[PDB]
């Protein structure tokens, strides 16, 4: 019940009820099984930088997103299970480097290159 | 992280991304038909 049904462009998924020690890479570890995340963001505080217990992940393919919403939902991680829903929010401009720094690590695999830079 | 199975046995033809260590996990939620 955290869906943003305003679109069907909801490649972003709400990952709620996460534990504190769960980081972006962790989320990627479980979610990459269901596809390739092109964007992922862990909702973490701007001061201390600690997880709020929420995340947003976006697969390349929204159908992969759907499979995660269902089949990865209810996976127990450290006493609590994670929740997936179709959320859509506009990425923050203030914290943009967090977003782009994340996709860089993902894009590494996504971009097929014989030559990366000229 | 590595692609273990090269067989698109997945209904969605999705193959595990390069950050999947190789731990197959699923809950088995029947919500999605």
């Amino acid at each position: 019940g955290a869906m943003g049904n305003e679109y069907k462009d909801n490649a972003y998924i709400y990952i709620g009820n996460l534990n504190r020690e769960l980081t972006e890479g962790d989320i990627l570890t479980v979610f990459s099984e269901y596809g390739v995340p092109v964007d992922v963001i862990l909702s973490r505080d701007e001061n201390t930088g600690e997880s709020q217990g929420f995340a947003y992940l976006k697969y390349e393919d929204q159908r992969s997103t759907i499979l995660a919403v269902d089949n990865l939902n209810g996976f127990k991680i450290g006493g609590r299970a994670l929740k997936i829903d179709h959320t859509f929010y506009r990425p923050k401009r203030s914290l943009q480097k967090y977003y782009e720094a994340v996709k860089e690590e993902l894009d590494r695999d996504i971009v097929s290159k014989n030559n990366a830079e000229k | 992280g590595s692609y273990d199975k090269p067989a698109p046995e997945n209904r969605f033809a999705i193959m595990p991304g390069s950050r999947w260590d190789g731990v197959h996990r699923s809950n088995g939620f029947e919500e999605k038909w």
């Binding site: 534990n19 980081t23 972006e24 990627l28 701007e46 991680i77 450290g78 480097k97 | 996990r25």
Partner: peptide, 23 residues
């Protein structure tokens, strides 16, 4: 703007130690 570091947060990218036991 800040020229020390971009944002102070930045992503971590690691598995949790929960995960290794939970999966």
């Amino acid at each position: 703007g800040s020229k020390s570091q971009y944002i102070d947060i930045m992503p971590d990218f690691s598995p949790s130690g929960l995960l290794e036991l939970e999966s």
